[PDB]
Enzyme design. Structure first.
Site, mmCIF file in Angstrom:
data_model
loop_
_atom_site.group_PDB
_atom_site.id
_atom_site.type_symbol
_atom_site.label_atom_id
_atom_site.label_comp_id
_atom_site.label_asym_id
_atom_site.label_seq_id
_atom_site.Cartn_x
_atom_site.Cartn_y
_atom_site.Cartn_z
ATOM 1 N N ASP A 1 0.880 -1.081 0.061
ATOM 2 C CA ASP A 1 0.002 -0.035 -0.008
ATOM 3 C C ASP A 1 1.083 1.033 -0.044
ATOM 4 O OD1 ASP A 1 -1.543 2.114 0.716
ATOM 5 O OD2 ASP A 1 -2.257 1.283 2.576
ATOM 6 N N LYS B 1 2.761 11.325 -4.200
ATOM 7 C CA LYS B 1 1.594 10.506 -4.472
ATOM 8 C C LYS B 1 0.632 11.738 -5.290
ATOM 9 C CE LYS B 1 -1.606 7.031 -3.383
ATOM 10 N NZ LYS B 1 -2.232 6.235 -2.471
ATOM 11 N N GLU C 1 -6.945 0.525 -4.592
ATOM 12 C CA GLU C 1 -6.855 0.287 -2.857
ATOM 13 C C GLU C 1 -8.327 -0.257 -2.455
ATOM 14 O OE1 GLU C 1 -5.604 4.438 -1.992
ATOM 15 O OE2 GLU C 1 -3.741 3.908 -2.877
ATOM 16 N N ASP D 1 -12.816 5.258 3.013
ATOM 17 C CA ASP D 1 -11.441 5.298 3.612
ATOM 18 C C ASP D 1 -10.954 6.604 4.078
ATOM 19 O OD1 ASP D 1 -8.617 5.573 3.317
ATOM 20 O OD2 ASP D 1 -8.534 4.338 1.558
#
Length: 381
Positions: free
Chosen positions: A8, A69, A173, A197
């Site tokens: 991850d 990211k 994800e 999330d």
């Protein structure tokens, strides 16, 4: 006897797992930590990755790269990149509409593509896995948000390649999270899954459909800058105001005092997930005055009210874009450390008419867990 890993590659932290001996092991690094900050620091003598990099971010802010990211696979001109830039202490430059992070490293000015920074975090995850397994690791599954485009997936793949990994697959994800809960192996039937999330910095709502083991993304909604850190800010501002109201002194201009208060607030916030009240005890916080106070769960809930209720807005939006009524959601999966907040779970459960939440897998590790399960499935051929 060569096991593949699942990684991850998170915005703020990364987590690595491995399916070995009929179960997943979420691997701890040398410090015993099961997550590694996605931070890379450049000093006048060395390059630091992980906790050593986050630890000194406020000390060396121009040379500590995080949020790579947020840049990976994007063009320099992208409105997202151009907006994110104004709030980062590091320099973002371009190499023909390709963004790059520019820093000072060992007396030299160095420039790095976002995938080069992420490859550094990935090399750390690879080493961590190798220290655990006792043999080299090269095969991996890397997760990405469901909303990433071909360019963002390709650049994540590139980061894995630079780290010497053979990227078996790039997977979403929320898909890894559903796989961790075994929602892909239910069998013959069509099911709707909602992944909620709530991370340290990002909030992502994904609606997936699973049919005969195959995954389909129906909707991706969320808030790019809402998370755990925003609940900390509310607690900090509250205690900065309480110190001022009690001792008639403003601490906010002392970096160390703000930092020590922020550290105490974040721990108080974690304690409030399992207890009704938390104690905050800072010796000589400012002007030599000891700060000994408390905060109740109810008070914390009020301070964050807007942020708490706002999490349903992307849930409602996701159901609309998915053309589904809330009753059509078969499974609810919680991901991200902030989902341990009782009010967050209450608001979501109440919304879905008392439906049970899939939360038995560590919410910080569930994404790596599914990626590790998936890596073992792909290599089993």
């Amino acid at each position: 006897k060569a096991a593949a890993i699942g990684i991850d590659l998170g915005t703020t932290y990364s987590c690595v797992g491995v399916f070995q001996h009929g179960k997943v092991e979420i691997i701890a690094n040398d410090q015993g930590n099961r997550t590694t900050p996605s931070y890379v620091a450049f000093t006048d003598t060395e390059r630091l990755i992980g906790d050593a990099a986050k630890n000194q971010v406020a000390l060396n802010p121009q040379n500590t790269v995080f949020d790579a990211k947020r840049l990976i696979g994007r063009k320099f001109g992208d409105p997202v990149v151009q907006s994110d830039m104004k709030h980062w202490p590091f320099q973002v430059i371009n190499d023909g509409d390709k963004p790059k992070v520019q820093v000072s490293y060992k007396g030299e000015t160095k420039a790095f593509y976002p995938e080069e920074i992420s490859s550094m975090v990935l090399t750390k995850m690879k080493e961590i896995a190798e220290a655990y397994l006792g043999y080299p690791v090269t095969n991996a599954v890397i997760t990405v948000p469901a909303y990433f485009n071909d360019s963002q997936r390709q650049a994540t793949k590139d980061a894995g390649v630079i780290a010497g990994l053979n990227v078996l697959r790039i997977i979403n994800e929320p898909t890894a999270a559903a796989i961790a809960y075994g929602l892909d192996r239910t069998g013959k039937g069509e099911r709707n899954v909602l992944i909620f999330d709530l991370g340290g910095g990002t909030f992502d709502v994904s609606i997936l459909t699973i049919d005969d083991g195959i995954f389909e993304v129906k909707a991706t909604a969320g808030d790019t800058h809402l998370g755990g850190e925003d609940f900390d800010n509310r607690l900090v501002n509250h205690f900065v105001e309480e110190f001022k109201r009690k001792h008639k002194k403003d601490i906010s201009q002392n970096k160390r005092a703000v930092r020590r208060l922020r550290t105490a607030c974040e721990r108080a916030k974690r304690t409030l997930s399992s207890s009704t009240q938390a104690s905050l005890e800072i010796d000589s916080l400012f002007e030599g005055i000891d700060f000994y106070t408390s905060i109740t769960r109810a008070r914390f809930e009020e301070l964050c009210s807007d942020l708490f209720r706002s999490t349903l807005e992307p849930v409602e939006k996701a159901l609309r874009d998915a053309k589904l009524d809330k009753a059509q959601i078969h499974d609810l999966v919680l991901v991200g450390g902030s989902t341990r907040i009782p009010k967050v779970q209450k608001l979501l459960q109440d919304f879905f008419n008392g439906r049970d939440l899939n939360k038995s897998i560590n919410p910080d590790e569930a994404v790596a867990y599914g990626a590790a399960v998936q890596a073992a499935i792909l290599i089993k051929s």
